[PDB]
Amino acid sequence: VSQNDIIKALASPLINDGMVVSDFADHVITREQNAPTGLPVEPVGVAIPHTDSKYVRQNAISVGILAEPVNFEDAGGEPDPVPVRVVFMLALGNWFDITNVLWWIMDVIQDADFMQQLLVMNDDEIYQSIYTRISEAAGMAGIHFRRHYVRHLPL
Amino acid sequence: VSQNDIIKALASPLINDGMVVSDFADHVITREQNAPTGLPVEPVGVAIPHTDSKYVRQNAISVGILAEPVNFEDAGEPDPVPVRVVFMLALGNWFDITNVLWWIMDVIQDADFMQQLLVMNDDEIYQSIYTRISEAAGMAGIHFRRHYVRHLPL
C-alpha cells in the first residue's frame, strides 16, 4: 500500500456517508504532501491525515489498521520516516473540534497496551473499543464514528 | 488594516529572529485563505493564523493587539469574526500544535484575562502571557520574547 491508497480507502466511508465533499481524498492528499501527519510514537506508529474544514460536512473519524507498516513522513521534518500501522483520518469542522480531537488522539496513543491491541483485534472489536473511548470523552461529542469507519488494509 | 497586514506585522519579529523562513508571512496568508483562523469567542474575537511546519525553524508565538476589529473568516458561519487579539503560531510538529491549541482554547475562555489584554501595555501583556505559558508544562520549548507582543498599528 502507498499513502495515497490508504487515504483513498479511508476517505471512502466518509464520502459515501456524506460526511465530506466528493473530492475530500484529493484534498487530504495535497494537505499530506505539504504537511505530513506521521507521528513518530512508539511502539506503534500513527498518522492523522486530514484536510481543511471547508471540505467537511459533518465531524467524523475513519480508522485504518495496516497489516504491514506504511511510511509517512515525520510531521516535524526528521529524515527517518514514520512506520505507520494505525491511521486516524480526521474530518473536522472548525478549530475547536480540531483542538479537542488532537488532544484526545495524542492521549490515546500514549496507551501502549491499547495500541498493541489495535494490531491484533478484528474490526468489530476495534470499533467497540474506540467507540467506547470516544463516548467517555466530552471533547469528542459530535464526532460521528460508525462500524464501517473501521477497516484493515489492504481490503 | 486587513489580515495580511496583521500577518506581515506579526511575522516580522519571528523572521528577524530566525524562528521562521524569510517568506513565512506569504505562506501564512495563503493558508489563511483556505483554512481561516478567526475564532468566534466571547467577549473578544481571536485569530490563530499559522502555516505548515516546513516554514518553521523554531517554535514561537507572536501576539498582536488591535485597536479596532479586523475580520478573519470563520472556518466552521458565513459572517466573519471581528478580531481584536491575534496569536500567530510558528510550530514545528503536531505534538506542539496540539499542546499550543489546547493552551490557547483555554486562555481565551478567561474573560477577565482577555479584557486585560485590551487595555494592558506591551510589558504587562508580555509578563502575563509569559507567566501563563511558563506555568504550562505542555508549553515548554515555545519561544516568547518581549518583542513578540505589539499593538497594531505600530
Coordinates of C-alpha atoms in Angstrom, one line a residue:
Chain A
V1 CA 0.0 0.0 0.0
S2 CA 1.0 3.6 -0.8
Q3 CA 0.0 6.6 1.3
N4 CA -2.5 7.7 -1.4
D5 CA -4.0 4.2 -1.5
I6 CA -4.6 4.4 2.3
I7 CA -6.0 8.0 2.2
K8 CA -8.5 7.0 -0.6
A9 CA -9.6 3.8 1.2
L10 CA -10.2 5.6 4.5
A11 CA -11.9 8.5 2.8
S12 CA -14.4 6.2 1.1
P13 CA -16.8 5.6 4.0
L14 CA -16.8 9.3 4.9
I15 CA -17.5 10.3 1.2
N16 CA -20.2 7.6 1.0
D17 CA -21.9 8.7 4.2
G18 CA -21.9 12.4 3.0
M19 CA -19.6 13.4 5.8
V20 CA -17.2 15.1 3.5
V21 CA -17.3 16.5 -0.1
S22 CA -16.8 14.2 -3.1
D23 CA -13.2 15.2 -3.7
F24 CA -12.2 15.1 0.0
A25 CA -9.4 12.5 -0.6
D26 CA -7.7 14.6 -3.2
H27 CA -7.5 17.4 -0.6
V28 CA -6.2 15.2 2.2
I29 CA -3.5 14.0 -0.3
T30 CA -2.4 17.6 -1.1
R31 CA -2.5 18.5 2.5
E32 CA -0.5 15.5 3.4
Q33 CA 2.2 16.4 0.8
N34 CA 2.6 19.9 2.4
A35 CA 2.0 18.9 6.0
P36 CA 2.9 15.3 6.8
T37 CA 0.9 13.6 9.6
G38 CA 3.3 10.8 10.6
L39 CA 3.6 10.7 14.4
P40 CA 6.8 9.1 15.5
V41 CA 5.3 7.5 18.6
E42 CA 6.3 4.1 19.9
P43 CA 5.7 1.2 19.8
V44 CA 3.0 1.7 17.1
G45 CA 3.4 4.5 14.5
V46 CA 0.3 6.6 13.8
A47 CA -0.8 9.0 11.2
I48 CA -3.6 11.6 11.3
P49 CA -4.3 12.6 7.7
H50 CA -6.8 15.3 7.2
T51 CA -7.6 18.5 5.2
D52 CA -9.4 21.8 5.7
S53 CA -12.8 22.2 7.2
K54 CA -14.4 23.7 4.0
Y55 CA -14.4 20.1 2.7
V56 CA -16.1 18.7 5.8
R57 CA -19.9 18.4 6.2
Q58 CA -20.2 16.5 9.4
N59 CA -17.5 15.6 12.0
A60 CA -16.1 12.1 11.6
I61 CA -13.1 9.8 12.1
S62 CA -12.2 6.9 9.8
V63 CA -9.7 4.3 11.2
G64 CA -7.4 2.1 9.3
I65 CA -5.3 -0.8 10.7
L66 CA -2.4 -1.7 8.4
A67 CA -1.1 -5.3 8.3
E68 CA 2.3 -4.1 7.3
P69 CA 3.8 -0.7 8.2
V70 CA 3.5 2.1 5.6
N71 CA 5.9 5.0 5.7
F72 CA 4.6 8.5 6.3
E73 CA 6.9 11.5 6.5
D74 CA 7.6 12.8 10.0
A75 CA 5.4 15.8 10.6
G76 CA 8.4 17.5 12.3
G77 CA 10.8 17.2 9.3
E78 CA 13.2 14.5 10.6
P79 CA 14.7 12.3 7.8
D80 CA 13.6 9.0 9.3
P81 CA 10.1 8.1 8.1
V82 CA 7.3 7.0 10.4
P83 CA 6.4 3.3 10.2
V84 CA 2.6 3.8 10.4
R85 CA 0.3 0.9 11.5
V86 CA -2.7 2.9 12.8
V87 CA -4.3 5.7 10.8
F88 CA -6.9 8.1 12.2
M89 CA -8.3 10.1 9.3
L90 CA -9.9 13.2 10.6
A91 CA -12.9 15.1 9.2
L92 CA -13.4 18.1 11.4
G93 CA -15.4 21.3 11.0
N94 CA -13.6 24.0 13.0
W95 CA -10.6 24.7 15.1
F96 CA -12.5 23.9 18.3
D97 CA -13.2 20.4 17.0
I98 CA -9.6 20.1 15.8
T99 CA -8.2 21.1 19.2
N100 CA -10.5 18.6 21.1
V101 CA -9.8 15.7 18.7
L102 CA -6.0 16.3 18.6
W103 CA -5.8 16.3 22.4
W104 CA -7.8 13.0 22.6
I105 CA -5.7 11.3 20.0
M106 CA -2.4 12.4 21.5
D107 CA -3.6 10.9 24.8
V108 CA -5.0 7.7 23.4
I109 CA -1.8 6.8 21.5
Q110 CA 0.3 7.0 24.7
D111 CA -1.6 3.9 25.9
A112 CA 1.0 1.3 24.7
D113 CA -1.1 -1.7 25.6
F114 CA -4.1 -0.3 23.8
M115 CA -2.1 0.5 20.7
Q116 CA -0.7 -3.1 20.6
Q117 CA -4.3 -4.4 21.0
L118 CA -5.4 -2.5 17.9
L119 CA -2.9 -4.6 15.9
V120 CA -4.5 -8.0 16.8
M121 CA -8.2 -7.2 17.2
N122 CA -10.8 -7.7 14.5
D123 CA -12.9 -4.8 13.1
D124 CA -15.8 -5.4 15.5
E125 CA -13.5 -5.3 18.5
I126 CA -11.7 -2.2 17.3
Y127 CA -14.9 -0.4 16.6
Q128 CA -16.3 -1.3 20.1
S129 CA -13.1 -0.3 21.8
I130 CA -12.7 3.1 20.0
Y131 CA -16.4 3.9 20.2
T132 CA -16.3 3.3 23.9
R133 CA -13.4 5.6 24.5
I134 CA -15.0 8.3 22.2
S135 CA -18.2 8.0 24.2
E136 CA -16.5 8.8 27.5
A137 CA -14.8 11.9 26.3
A138 CA -16.9 15.1 26.4
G139 CA -14.5 16.7 23.9
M140 CA -15.4 14.1 21.4
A141 CA -19.1 14.8 21.5
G142 CA -20.5 15.4 18.0
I143 CA -17.9 13.2 16.2
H144 CA -19.5 10.5 14.0
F145 CA -18.0 7.1 14.4
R146 CA -19.7 4.1 12.8
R147 CA -18.9 0.5 12.4
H148 CA -17.9 1.0 8.7
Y149 CA -15.4 3.6 9.9
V150 CA -13.1 0.8 10.8
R151 CA -11.1 -1.3 8.4
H152 CA -7.9 -3.3 7.9
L153 CA -5.8 -2.6 4.8
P154 CA -5.4 -3.9 2.4
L155 CA -9.1 -4.5 2.0
Chain B
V1 CA -5.9 47.2 8.3
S2 CA -6.6 43.8 6.7
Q3 CA -5.5 40.3 7.7
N4 CA -2.4 40.3 5.6
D5 CA -1.2 43.5 7.2
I6 CA -1.6 42.0 10.6
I7 CA 0.0 38.7 9.4
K8 CA 3.0 40.5 8.0
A9 CA 3.4 42.7 11.1
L10 CA 3.4 39.7 13.5
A11 CA 5.6 37.7 11.2
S12 CA 8.4 40.3 11.3
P13 CA 9.9 39.6 14.7
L14 CA 9.9 35.8 14.0
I15 CA 11.6 36.3 10.7
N16 CA 14.2 38.6 12.2
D17 CA 14.9 36.1 15.0
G18 CA 15.3 33.2 12.5
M19 CA 12.3 31.4 14.1
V20 CA 10.7 31.0 10.6
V21 CA 11.8 31.2 6.9
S22 CA 12.0 34.5 5.1
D23 CA 8.7 34.1 3.2
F24 CA 6.8 32.8 6.2
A25 CA 4.2 35.6 6.0
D26 CA 3.1 34.7 2.5
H27 CA 2.6 31.0 3.4
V28 CA 0.6 32.1 6.5
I29 CA -1.5 34.3 4.2
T30 CA -2.1 31.5 1.6
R31 CA -3.1 29.0 4.3
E32 CA -5.5 31.6 5.9
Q33 CA -7.3 31.7 2.6
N34 CA -8.2 28.0 2.6
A35 CA -8.2 27.4 6.4
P36 CA -9.3 30.6 8.1
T37 CA -8.3 31.1 11.8
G38 CA -10.9 33.5 13.2
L39 CA -12.3 32.2 16.4
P40 CA -15.8 33.4 17.2
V41 CA -15.3 33.6 21.0
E42 CA -16.8 36.0 23.6
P43 CA -16.1 38.6 24.8
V44 CA -13.1 39.2 22.4
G45 CA -12.7 37.9 18.9
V46 CA -9.4 36.0 18.4
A47 CA -7.4 34.6 15.5
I48 CA -4.7 31.9 15.4
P49 CA -3.0 32.4 12.0
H50 CA -0.3 29.9 11.1
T51 CA 1.1 27.8 8.3
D52 CA 2.8 24.4 7.7
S53 CA 5.8 23.3 9.8
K54 CA 8.2 23.2 6.8
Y55 CA 8.2 27.0 7.0
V56 CA 9.1 26.9 10.7
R57 CA 12.7 26.8 12.2
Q58 CA 11.9 27.1 15.9
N59 CA 8.7 27.2 18.0
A60 CA 7.4 30.7 18.7
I61 CA 4.3 32.8 19.3
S62 CA 3.7 36.4 18.1
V63 CA 1.0 38.4 19.7
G64 CA -0.9 41.3 18.3
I65 CA -3.5 43.6 20.0
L66 CA -5.7 45.5 17.6
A67 CA -7.3 48.9 18.4
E68 CA -10.2 48.3 16.1
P69 CA -11.5 44.9 14.9
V70 CA -10.1 43.2 11.8
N71 CA -12.1 40.5 10.2
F72 CA -10.8 36.9 9.9
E73 CA -13.1 34.3 8.3
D74 CA -14.8 31.6 10.4
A75 CA -13.8 28.0 9.5
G76 CA -17.0 26.5 11.0
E77 CA -20.8 30.5 9.7
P78 CA -20.9 32.9 6.7
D79 CA -20.2 36.1 8.7
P80 CA -16.5 36.8 9.6
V81 CA -15.1 37.2 13.1
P82 CA -14.2 40.7 14.3
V83 CA -10.8 40.0 15.9
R84 CA -9.0 42.1 18.5
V85 CA -6.4 39.7 19.7
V86 CA -4.1 37.6 17.4
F87 CA -1.9 34.7 18.3
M88 CA 0.4 34.0 15.3
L89 CA 1.8 30.5 15.7
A90 CA 5.1 29.1 14.4
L91 CA 5.1 25.4 15.4
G92 CA 7.3 22.5 14.2
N93 CA 5.1 19.4 14.7
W94 CA 1.7 18.0 15.6
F95 CA 2.6 17.5 19.3
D96 CA 3.5 21.2 19.5
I97 CA 0.3 22.2 17.6
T98 CA -1.9 20.1 20.0
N99 CA -0.3 21.5 23.1
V100 CA -0.5 25.1 21.9
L101 CA -4.1 24.8 20.7
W102 CA -5.1 23.2 24.0
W103 CA -3.5 26.1 25.8
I104 CA -5.0 28.8 23.5
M105 CA -8.5 27.5 23.7
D106 CA -8.3 27.5 27.5
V107 CA -6.8 31.0 27.7
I108 CA -9.4 32.7 25.5
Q109 CA -12.3 31.4 27.7
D110 CA -10.9 33.5 30.6
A111 CA -12.9 36.7 30.0
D112 CA -11.0 38.7 32.6
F113 CA -7.6 38.0 31.1
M114 CA -8.9 38.6 27.6
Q115 CA -10.3 42.0 28.8
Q116 CA -7.0 42.8 30.4
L117 CA -5.2 42.2 27.0
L118 CA -7.3 45.1 25.5
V119 CA -6.0 47.7 28.0
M120 CA -2.7 46.3 29.2
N121 CA 0.6 47.7 27.9
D122 CA 3.2 45.6 25.9
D123 CA 5.3 45.0 29.0
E124 CA 2.2 43.9 31.0
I125 CA 0.9 41.7 28.2
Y126 CA 4.3 40.1 27.9
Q127 CA 4.6 39.3 31.6
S128 CA 1.1 37.9 31.8
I129 CA 1.4 35.7 28.7
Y130 CA 4.9 34.6 29.7
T131 CA 3.6 33.6 33.2
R132 CA 0.7 31.6 31.7
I133 CA 3.0 29.9 29.1
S134 CA 5.6 29.0 31.7
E135 CA 3.1 27.7 34.2
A136 CA 2.1 25.2 31.5
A137 CA 4.3 22.1 31.2
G138 CA 2.9 21.4 27.7
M139 CA 4.0 24.8 26.6
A140 CA 7.7 24.0 27.1
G141 CA 10.0 24.8 24.2
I142 CA 7.8 27.6 22.8
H143 CA 9.8 30.9 22.3
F144 CA 8.1 34.0 23.6
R145 CA 10.1 37.2 23.8
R146 CA 9.3 40.8 24.8
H147 CA 9.2 41.9 21.2
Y148 CA 6.7 39.1 20.3
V149 CA 4.0 41.4 21.7
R150 CA 2.7 44.5 19.8
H151 CA -0.2 46.8 19.4
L152 CA -1.1 47.4 15.8
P153 CA -0.9 49.8 14.0
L154 CA 2.8 50.2 15.1

